[PDB]
Amino acid sequence: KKQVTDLRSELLDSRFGAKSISTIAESKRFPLHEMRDDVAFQIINDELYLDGNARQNLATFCQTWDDENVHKLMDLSINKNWIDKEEYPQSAAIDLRCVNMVADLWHAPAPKNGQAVGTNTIGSSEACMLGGMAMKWRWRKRMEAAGKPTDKPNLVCGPVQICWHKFARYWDVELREIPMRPGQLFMDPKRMIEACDENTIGVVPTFGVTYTGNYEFPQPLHDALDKFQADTGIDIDMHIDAASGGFLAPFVAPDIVWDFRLPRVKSISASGHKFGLAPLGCGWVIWRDEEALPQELVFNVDYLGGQIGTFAINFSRPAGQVIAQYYEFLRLGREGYTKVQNASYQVAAYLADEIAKLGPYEFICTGRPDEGIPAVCFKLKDGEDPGYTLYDLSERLRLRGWQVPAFTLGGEATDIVVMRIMCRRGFEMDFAELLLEDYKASLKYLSDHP
Amino acid sequence: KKQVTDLRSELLDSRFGAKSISTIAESKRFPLHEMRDDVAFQIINDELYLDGNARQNLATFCQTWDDENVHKLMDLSINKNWIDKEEYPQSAAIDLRCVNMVADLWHAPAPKNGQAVGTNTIGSSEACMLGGMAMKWRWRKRMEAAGKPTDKPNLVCGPVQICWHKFARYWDVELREIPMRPGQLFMDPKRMIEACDENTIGVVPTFGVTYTGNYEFPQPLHDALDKFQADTGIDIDMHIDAASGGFLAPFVAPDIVWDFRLPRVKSISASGHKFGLAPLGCGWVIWRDEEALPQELVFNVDYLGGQIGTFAINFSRPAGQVIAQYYEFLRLGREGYTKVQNASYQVAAYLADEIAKLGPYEFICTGRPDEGIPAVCFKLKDGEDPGYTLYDLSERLRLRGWQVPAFTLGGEATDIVVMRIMCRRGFEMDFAELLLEDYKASLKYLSDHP
Amino acid sequence: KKQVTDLRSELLDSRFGAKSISTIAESKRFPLHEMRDDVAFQIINDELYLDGNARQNLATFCQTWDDENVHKLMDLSINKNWIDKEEYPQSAAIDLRCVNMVADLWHAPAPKNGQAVGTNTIGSSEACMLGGMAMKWRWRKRMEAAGKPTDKPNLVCGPVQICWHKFARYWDVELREIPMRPGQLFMDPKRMIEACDENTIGVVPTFGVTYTGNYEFPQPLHDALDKFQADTGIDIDMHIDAASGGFLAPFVAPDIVWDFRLPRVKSISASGHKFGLAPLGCGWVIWRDEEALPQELVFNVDYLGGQIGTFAINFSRPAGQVIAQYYEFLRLGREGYTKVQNASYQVAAYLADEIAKLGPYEFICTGRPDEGIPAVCFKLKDGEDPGYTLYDLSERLRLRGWQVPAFTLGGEATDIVVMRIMCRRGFEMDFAELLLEDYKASLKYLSDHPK
Amino acid sequence: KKQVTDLRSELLDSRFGAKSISTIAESKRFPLHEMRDDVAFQIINDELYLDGNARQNLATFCQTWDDENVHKLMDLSINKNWIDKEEYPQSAAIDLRCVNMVADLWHAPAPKNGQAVGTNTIGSSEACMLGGMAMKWRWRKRMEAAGKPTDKPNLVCGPVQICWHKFARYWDVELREIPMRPGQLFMDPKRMIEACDENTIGVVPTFGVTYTGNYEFPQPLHDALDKFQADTGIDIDMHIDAASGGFLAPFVAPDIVWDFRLPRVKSISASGHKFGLAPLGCGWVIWRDEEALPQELVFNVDYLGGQIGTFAINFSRPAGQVIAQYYEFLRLGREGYTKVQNASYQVAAYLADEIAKLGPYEFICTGRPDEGIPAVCFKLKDGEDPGYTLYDLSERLRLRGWQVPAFTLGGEATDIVVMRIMCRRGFEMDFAELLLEDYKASLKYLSDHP
Numbered sequence A, B, D: 001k002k003q004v005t006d007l008r009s010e011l012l013d014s015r016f017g018a019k020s021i022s023t024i025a026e027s028k029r030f031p032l033h034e035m036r037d038d039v040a041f042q043i044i045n046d047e048l049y050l051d052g053n054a055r056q057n058l059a060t061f062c063q064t065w066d067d068e069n070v071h072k073l074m075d076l077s078i079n080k081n082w083i084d085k086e087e088y089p090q091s092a093a094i095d096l097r098c099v100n101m102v103a104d105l106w107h108a109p110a111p112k113n114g115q116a117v118g119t120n121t122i123g124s125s126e127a128c129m130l131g132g133m134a135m136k137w138r139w140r141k142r143m144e145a146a147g148k149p150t151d152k153p154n155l156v157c158g159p160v161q162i163c164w165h166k167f168a169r170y171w172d173v174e175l176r177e178i179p180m181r182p183g184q185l186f187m188d189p190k191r192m193i194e195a196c197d198e199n200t201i202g203v204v205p206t207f208g209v210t211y212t213g214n215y216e217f218p219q220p221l222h223d224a225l226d227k228f229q230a231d232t233g234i235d236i237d238m239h240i241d242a243a244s245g246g247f248l249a250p251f252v253a254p255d256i257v258w259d260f261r262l263p264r265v266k267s268i269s270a271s272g273h274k275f276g277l278a279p280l281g282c283g284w285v286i287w288r289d290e291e292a293l294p295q296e297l298v299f300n301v302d303y304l305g306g307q308i309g310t311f312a313i314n315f316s317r318p319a320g321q322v323i324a325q326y327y328e329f330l331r332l333g334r335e336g337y338t339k340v341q342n343a344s345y346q347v348a349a350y351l352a353d354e355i356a357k358l359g360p361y362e363f364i365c366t367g368r369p370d371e372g373i374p375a376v377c378f379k380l381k382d383g384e385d386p387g388y389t390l391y392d393l394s395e396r397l398r399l400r401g402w403q404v405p406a407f408t409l410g411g412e413a414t415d416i417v418v419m420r421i422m423c424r425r426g427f428e429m430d431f432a433e434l435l436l437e438d439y440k441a442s443l444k445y446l447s448d449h450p
Numbered sequence C: 001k002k003q004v005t006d007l008r009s010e011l012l013d014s015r016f017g018a019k020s021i022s023t024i025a026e027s028k029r030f031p032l033h034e035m036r037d038d039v040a041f042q043i044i045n046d047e048l049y050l051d052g053n054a055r056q057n058l059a060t061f062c063q064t065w066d067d068e069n070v071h072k073l074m075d076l077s078i079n080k081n082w083i084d085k086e087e088y089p090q091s092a093a094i095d096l097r098c099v100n101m102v103a104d105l106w107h108a109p110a111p112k113n114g115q116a117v118g119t120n121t122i123g124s125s126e127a128c129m130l131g132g133m134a135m136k137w138r139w140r141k142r143m144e145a146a147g148k149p150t151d152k153p154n155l156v157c158g159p160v161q162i163c164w165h166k167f168a169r170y171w172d173v174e175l176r177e178i179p180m181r182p183g184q185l186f187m188d189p190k191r192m193i194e195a196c197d198e199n200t201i202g203v204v205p206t207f208g209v210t211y212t213g214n215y216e217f218p219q220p221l222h223d224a225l226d227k228f229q230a231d232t233g234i235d236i237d238m239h240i241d242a243a244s245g246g247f248l249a250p251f252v253a254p255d256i257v258w259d260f261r262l263p264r265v266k267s268i269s270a271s272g273h274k275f276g277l278a279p280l281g282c283g284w285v286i287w288r289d290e291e292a293l294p295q296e297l298v299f300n301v302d303y304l305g306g307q308i309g310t311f312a313i314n315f316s317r318p319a320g321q322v323i324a325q326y327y328e329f330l331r332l333g334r335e336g337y338t339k340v341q342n343a344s345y346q347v348a349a350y351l352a353d354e355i356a357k358l359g360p361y362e363f364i365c366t367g368r369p370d371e372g373i374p375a376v377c378f379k380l381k382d383g384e385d386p387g388y389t390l391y392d393l394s395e396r397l398r399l400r401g402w403q404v405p406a407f408t409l410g411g412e413a414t415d416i417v418v419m420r421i422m423c424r425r426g427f428e429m430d431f432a433e434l435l436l437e438d439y440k441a442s443l444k445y446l447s448d449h450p451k
């Protein structure tokens, strides 16, 4: 009989009075029975509060805010499968438009074909691996032609992001990473060349180093490679990892030569969901021409009576991000992006200037558009001790919900501890002022409590 | 004067009356100026109508519908980055619960420290490549131990999905694919063994073949491999590609032994956004134990005063799907999933029965839960000419917005043309009846027009 | 133990997991029990996907898009009964303001009572029948005065829309329809006169012919009728069927004299839900003065102390459309409408120009504001053969969701097959370009597959 | 120089601080310029408040409330054109399902080919005119056959609704309306017959008289017509005007024989937007068989290879209501409707009982389901005077927003003043109690102020 009583409650009982919400959520085995949808939702929604406030997350590089239209486009495309080119043809079409534009944006040679050579991706990581395989294949072919061994390929680069380490491991490539050293936290021409040989599949400059936020200018490295060929006959290509810079420089530092204007640059990759203003789940990779992308890596698909080529490690995935990306392009344009990016740099500059007045800080990065991304990276002046450590400050800030990372650099600077503040879209001046206030407040506390 | 008149219009002009919407959308170069967001949105929204109705797309296997709560959870997590374990800790937590849960659904051995060994992925593709590298590495190690060459690895499998071909290409592995042949459109024990040798990294059965919708039972293949070892001493492992079956059999055919109940199965993968009921952008891969996943492939990350391992090709990406998947698990449970899956099978069976009464057909798949996924896959009886070809029929149906594919099988059955109807969640009986009606209607037309 | 088991499911089951959605929808008898509202809704919502995409329906003349405000106004007025003038007084009031504004747009003589004479309708059809009865009654009275028989009334017109045929049938009037003939797909002065007599209740020019999209200019027909009276003493009135043109010309071709500027025009009708930008369910009909509308057809109703006359076939009905129409008027005004209408003509012109370069077509309408509505109408150049009929092409386009009709004209042109593309609000340039693309694509396929 | 200001203002000004809202709305000529959409909306929205509260409108018979789903279905179908059968096929399909269902509800002979004869309409009015022409045509044909004059047709009826008067006028038919008289406010058998002749096209009983809310039982009238034919050989048909009753009796008084169970009833009409629970803009008319509907009144249109007849005065119009009506049918069914209608009757009965205790009243309708619609209709007992008139009361109640009509009956009862309260869906008991309270309060005031 109670089954009826209990059943009436499953019905009328409120949400927090419901019996279904009186136990802890399952975490070990697949649940047995179904439950009130509202309770299940409520439970998960509430658990998520423990993630903290994304808008206050100053560690991430990825977008933490989206405009109303992107939200709608995403919900509208929650089921559009980016991979089924023939089934969702217009989405496929839009994707191609974006490839042209990004390629265009990066000064790629006008596609005489009428359609730039590139592809969308879940993020820069996939993009990089695509670019990676591209290089390994191009290299492999070249060596086989000159009848040389192709079993000891290596990749030369500076302080790259973890995904390159992953590439090297998964595709068995020796990663020759020029280490960071006091005074030079990046790959310089000299040390680069000293690492190149006939087995080098390419060099990967990082146009926007994660750890520091500074650009790794390709120009000088490009020259060095030109000379290197003149001296050894070894022709080395470049792949720019512009996850960050890719959607920054083009708008606020158009004179920095880092893209396809450089001959050795055969491919560029960037994260659309970082400064590209697209929602998480979007990356881009562009090749300078059909000759830069080995046909053996491309798998053709049926697209509108013809055949379009694909090259992606993933398969089925939402098309929402690409659609949104295209939206931001049409809605903002160069003008728009510039204004938005400036806003970020403006804030980064401000914080850098202000924070400098509150302690013995040596700034590694101060949001100068001609030097890198809208970031503020710094460490304690060597030797000097203010009473705290950057780790300490960080913690204090976390008490107000802020996530401002404090970490050690790598290579030959493992004893240098820096703090890095990222100024993404949606971290307006007024909001950043609050950060500053809590920063001053934190110092005061650390002072009164040695 | 003019600029002000123009501007006042840019301000009061209605959406369609405005000047910004009087030109074709940009598709070749990055836009120069910003424009009214409502126009930009409208343009894109409308272009998307050319994608067709996803609910009527009977070709895809991925979810084309999501409940109200998933929509909310997705919008709420539009900016949660699944990769930043330390920054969005609870999302990370929830993900782990999921793995546990999936591993449980597949009989994985009682996990160690309360946490099964697995990872979430963008889709089955990434999952499979993860499982792939796992095998190659396990094999490589083994061979090096016995001091044998590891430069000629091959993978044995039946009619796999394109991602495996991609795996083989990207990771340089010989793909030995047992071809489909009339009467046997899958990998049989005999032909499998004839393809295995000491260089075989593993066998990949496809628990839910795409082309036909039928299961490729691992049991028989497993026995064959047991014997094979007894005769050659060669121990071969399996990796089940359960993109489809993975979230079907467990609920409607629990007695089919295909998972971890089989000793040789070291890893299983499945598409969460297919029959897992998760929105696009979610896949799963589980390993039998810590010994099946080579530590060299794992990159530890900081997480809750300790180190957690991560294995993925991607990096930054939305955590929405994993959060949603967890939701569907708690809200539905075995009971729920069963009910939902049954609904699908019920429809597939209905269509298969009805369609049979309208033409000279030989069914390859008829929505039998004990044979495979909820799909209807048939062909014209060898030697019959009803007046039309399945291609013709597909096109007549598209006239009503339906997408019912007609294609040729591969291997030794390249001259066999089949039609395949997928019955996903959200293709209820009443809705399928309408397909049937249009089906009958199409036949009538094709009849009246020889 | 089973009813509770099954009940708990009714409660907890998923939408599609639910048992209620495991059967086909009822279609023969009134359902017996109630069911989960969400399921019932889901079922219907999904069936509707089979209607196709309205935005891609290039056959219809009626609005296929509405702004956010109209949507709200409609939702807000889902229960306001347009007929209960005394119960929903302000709606009634707003309605009247519209009649005044339409009458003003059409130059109707300025009313001295302050309120023009006209009424709102569900659509042009009802409007036309109201205008029809008006004429029959005016005629009937006139004849009875001159002591003549009133049992053989006829109506003269060109290629009218089906509703007129319906009028003729329902109200027993002989319909003398001047047939379309190659080179002249409309009613010309000469053939018109040859059909008029003392039994003719009136002539109905169609200011925006459906089949071709061209205007049927009243000016010349008006003159002809003036002469006709001078020679026979027979005074014939006109009723313009401006379902389309009514809300087009006034903004993009103000010089075309077709409205009340013409003396014989006693009444005009137009579809508000067509180019009037109102949501489906709105039409208008205006009379030039209180003398053009026979009081015997009017039913006065109590309205705020005084009296107000009601002339309409339908009784109860949504006031939403009227309210929305008024909104569009205030929000857009002449300026607004003009910009919107231009956008349409602009697209129609573009398509017409581009499609012409793809084959041996002879155009019947190129979207010129001075000739007709925003539409592109055409046929295959007489005696030509590119390897396909316009019907085939139509089909090829349906495969992309487009609905572009291909049909045969009537009268003496029954062997001429045309295709007609309608460019309504919400068929922006970028969107139309996609149509063009698919059009080129269709031709290519038809080419590679002669069979 | 001032313009640029007016513009900047028209851009930032709030809705009410804007200049566009400082003038009275245009009401004489078509506006010249466009204006801020928000202002235009606001203006109209606010004017509409002067309409009063529809939920409190107890004079109307039409729905004044709709469930959330109907609202969505209506918004979803704001652009579906009910007339374009070929262009919006499924809506057309749904429509037909309703026709069968209503026919089934009224006991029409089970259709011959799975489809009953009838059509949807904007409201009962159009439905009645369709039924009217039907009769005139049937009659006309009959007479022509027997070679008799067809220029003096008349229609016999009781206290019909205004639309019939309109029918008579527009289609030139003599309306013989048996007048209401004290003690008999409806058409009785005897006076009906005394009005019938060979020129009578039919008799129209009103199954739910507006003025009083009581049913006009067809049974007795039907018998009288049977006899009439036996004595004169004149066969007269009936057309029931069940605008109200049509969707009431079937559920709460199934034993009242008034529909197609009666042989002479060749057509029935009813307002779906009244007690059919459909939103305004929906009516129905059903014919007993293909022989009752003159093919000359039908016009055919191409629909799915075939064709279907369309009898309808209107043309283009929304399909939302029909779609909603179908929804209410499936969601409620007999069970549902019965529960909803009972709720209304229950309220009507309650008010009738309570109001009777407040003054010297004589009731004409007390919400009995076996006598008529859920309404309360009373007058002051003859020659009795409480100190007011039903007009005063009506007015006093209006002061609280209530619209409770007080009017005089017609015919030979023009000196009888009645008050009529309509109890539609959405006038629940608790709500009605408030009316009662204000009713008592009104009486008290009228008492203290002679």
Ligand SMILES: *Cc1c(COP(=O)(O)O)cnc(C)c1O
Binding pocket: A061, A122, A123, A124, A125, A126, A160, A161, A163, A206, A208, A209, A210, A241, A243, A244, A271, A283, B314, B315, B316, B317
């Ligand atoms: C952030 C970043 C990546 C990773 O890109 P995702 O979008 O996370 O896939 C790779 N390289 C660099 C230099 C980065 O900053």
Ligand SMILES: *Cc1c(COP(=O)(O)O)cnc(C)c1O
Binding pocket: A314, A315, A316, A317, B061, B122, B123, B124, B125, B126, B160, B161, B163, B206, B208, B209, B210, B241, B243, B244, B271, B283
């Ligand atoms: C659909 C499918 C895949 C690809 O799944 P994704 O989610 O797109 O990665 C892989 N394998 C099989 C057997 C499949 O059916």
Ligand SMILES: *Cc1c(COP(=O)(O)O)cnc(C)c1O
Binding pocket: C061, C122, C123, C124, C125, C126, C128, C160, C161, C163, C206, C208, C209, C210, C241, C242, C243, C244, C270, C271, C272, C282, C283, D314, D315, D316
């Ligand atoms: C569309 C049209 C009609 C029909 O009027 P509705 O508003 O659709 O009821 C009548 N006449 C003409 C000339 C039309 O174009």
Ligand SMILES: *Cc1c(COP(=O)(O)O)cnc(C)c1O
Binding pocket: C314, C315, C316, C317, D061, D122, D123, D124, D125, D126, D161, D163, D206, D208, D209, D210, D241, D242, D243, D244, D271, D283
């Ligand atoms: C309300 C009513 C009508 C009017 O029909 P509408 O649905 O209002 O168009 C006609 N007859 C009767 C008996 C009515 O009650």
Ligand SMILES: [Br-]
Binding pocket: A014, A015, A016, A017
């Ligand atoms: Br609560």
Ligand SMILES: [Br-]
Binding pocket: A014, A015, A016
């Ligand atoms: Br609650």
Ligand SMILES: [Br-]
Binding pocket: A064, A065, A066, B079
């Ligand atoms: Br956001």
Ligand SMILES: [Br-]
Binding pocket: A181, A182, A183, A184, A413, A416
């Ligand atoms: Br340093």
Ligand SMILES: [Br-]
Binding pocket: B014, B015, B016, B017, C067, C340, C425
């Ligand atoms: Br507009």
Ligand SMILES: [Br-]
Binding pocket: B014, B015, B016, C067, C068
């Ligand atoms: Br707008």
Ligand SMILES: [Br-]
Binding pocket: A079, B064, B065, B066
């Ligand atoms: Br959805």
Ligand SMILES: [Br-]
Binding pocket: B182, B183, B184, B416
């Ligand atoms: Br076969």
Ligand SMILES: [Br-]
Binding pocket: B067, B340, B425, C014, C015, C016, C017
């Ligand atoms: Br579900």
Ligand SMILES: [Br-]
Binding pocket: B067, B068, C014, C015, C016
């Ligand atoms: Br649900």
Ligand SMILES: [Br-]
Binding pocket: C064, C065, C066, C067
């Ligand atoms: Br819309």
Ligand SMILES: [Br-]
Binding pocket: C181, C182, C183, C184, C413, C416
């Ligand atoms: Br012609």
